[PDB]
Write a protein that binds this ligand. Structure first.
Ligand SMILES: [Cl-]
Ligand SMILES: [Cl-]
Lengths: 204, 216
């Protein structure tokens, strides 16, 4: 088979891919990947031009001539520096975060909106990588997507769940209505679905 | 506010930060960090305007009124899909990867040139149709996953190599003298906080990062 071109948003790509490759070898053993990571907007534009075959992005997503399929829901968690007061709380986070310094990802990341919608000087990182290590060092607190949280990273900060129903995002596969590789696409949505990504609720 | 503003290149930040954060809690346990990851040239401009207190970059680096202090050398390794011929090879990779499809980082990554300048059978392809025809990924993240998917082979910095990703591709050593990069600390020459600086170099030197040789 010949290369599928897949684009994933920044806040998803580094976490989904490792598992997508493994389950892709089950579902499309002979199909190489050509991979793009980028902002939703530049990703939509590139898919519209057929520069890229399918992209993984998140609600809200609506675009003429483009089809999306649900993949999974991914809950958010609050992270805080070691010794932050929320360390005493079980899963006590609603919008008690109005009184805290919160790092939000830069504009262009759909993750700024989805946390903002849950609850100039606004402390802000360009990425999860810089945001998690800023928090680790005590600069402030943030909100991360479940799949961005290493089992092994309670050494760096503390993950404090939201209470009740956590804010979450819906990750989806977007592709052109007129796309003409039905087998590659279908093989792709199955690798993702059989991927075994931790921390999410697959949509079935 | 006690906050030290530190910038690091893309191909360094994700691998050094976690350890650095841990060393830093011994050597400046009250110094919070503002961080930026970016391309070298972007980073230098920020250092110069004082938006950032210091930056982590690699050789070659020379800039007027900027000082650098070496931190470590970091070898490169070839990575190849599962089942690639290089897999039964010894540590055989000289530059006989002029014969292979070689993924390389996009323009703005100093790692593009370091990989190039090592080999030359590879600069040839760039001389050809290069710099857009070239087979490239903007990040080590997309590259590692194209190599693992089947797409091609590549050359990676040691500290990017998960001791537990033999699942995805195969790490092939360069024979004899591995090509390497030199990671260094750069700051303006008359920075007012020599103590902040010195705790940074200290925390990095003691970070215990794997696969590098520290420069003492
Ligand atoms: Cl990120
Ligand atoms: Cl540069």
């Amino acid at each position: 088979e010949g290369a599928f071109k897949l684009g994933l948003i920044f806040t998803v790509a580094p976490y989904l891919l490792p598992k997508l490759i493994v389950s892709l070898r089950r579902t499309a053993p002979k199909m190489p990947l050509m991979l793009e990571e980028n902002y939703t907007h530049t990703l939509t534009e590139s898919l519209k031009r057929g520069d890229v075959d399918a992209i993984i992005v998140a609600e809200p997503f609506q675009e003429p001539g483009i089809v999306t399929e649900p993949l999974y829901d991914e809950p958010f968690f609050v992270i805080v520096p070691k010794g932050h007061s929320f360390e005493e709380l079980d899963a006590v986070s609603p919008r008690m975060l109005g009184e805290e310094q919160v790092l939000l990802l830069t504009e262009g990341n759909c993750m700024r909106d989805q946390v903002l919608s849950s609850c100039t000087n606004t402390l802000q990182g360009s990425s999860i990588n810089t945001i998690r290590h800023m928090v680790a060092s005590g600069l402030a607190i943030s909100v991360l997507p479940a799949t961005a949280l290493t089992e092994n990273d309670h050494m760096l900060f503390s993950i404090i769940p939201f209470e009740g129903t956590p804010p979450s995002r819906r990750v989806v596969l977007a592709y052109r209505r007129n796309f003409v590789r039905p087998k590659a696409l279908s093989a792709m949505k199955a690798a993702i679905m059989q991927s075994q990504l931790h921390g999410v609720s697959f949509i079935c």
